[PDB]
Amino acid sequence: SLGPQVAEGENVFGVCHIFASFNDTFVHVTDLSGKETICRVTGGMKVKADRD
RNA sequence: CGGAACUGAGGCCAUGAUUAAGAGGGACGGCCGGGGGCAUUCGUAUUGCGCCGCUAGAGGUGAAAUUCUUGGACCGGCGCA
Numbered sequence: 233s234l235g236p237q238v239a240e241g242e243n244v245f246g247v248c249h250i251f252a253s254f255n256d257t258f259v260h261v262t263d264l265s266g267k268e269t270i271c272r273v274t275g276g277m278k279v280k281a282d283r284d
Numbered sequence: 285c286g287g288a289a290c291u292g293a294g295g296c297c298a299u300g301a302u303u304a305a306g307a308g309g310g311a312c313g314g315c316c317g318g319g320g321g322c323a324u325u326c327g328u329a330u331u332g333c334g335c336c337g338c339u340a341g342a343g344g345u346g347a348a349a350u351u352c353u354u355g356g357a358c359c360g361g362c363g364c365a
Contacts, residue, residue, distance in 0.1 A: 255344070265361075266361050273339095276342075281347095282309090
């Protein structure tokens with residue numbers, strides 16, 4: 233029961249927190265507070281070499 | 285009689301001081317300014333430290349490595365110095 237307030241229109245908010253720069257890129261979904269995290273992901277966990 | 289030193293009272297002179305620098309000094313009035321010294325309050329950032337959460341990479345390069353990394357890095361969060 234993940235957000236059991238079932239109305240099929242009650243949208244559930246989060247925040248994303250993109251940290252972009254050179255040599256990296258992060259995507260860090262969290263709740264409204266930034267205290268609880270949901271699947272932080274990067275660019276280095278997908279490609280093979282370090283210059284891409 | 286001359287010229288010496290000294291002391292007293294008087295009338296006379298149209299009776300005596302050049303102006304005030306587009307030279308300067310000082311005074312006075314209202315302002316002006318990241319001018320100078322002493323004490324005072326504020327700011328985000330950085331670095332470290334503590335506690336919480338999820339997860340394998342993070343840095344840095346033209347490209348790499350030295351280096352940090354499940355004994356929990358980098359990211360996010362609240363505090364403190």
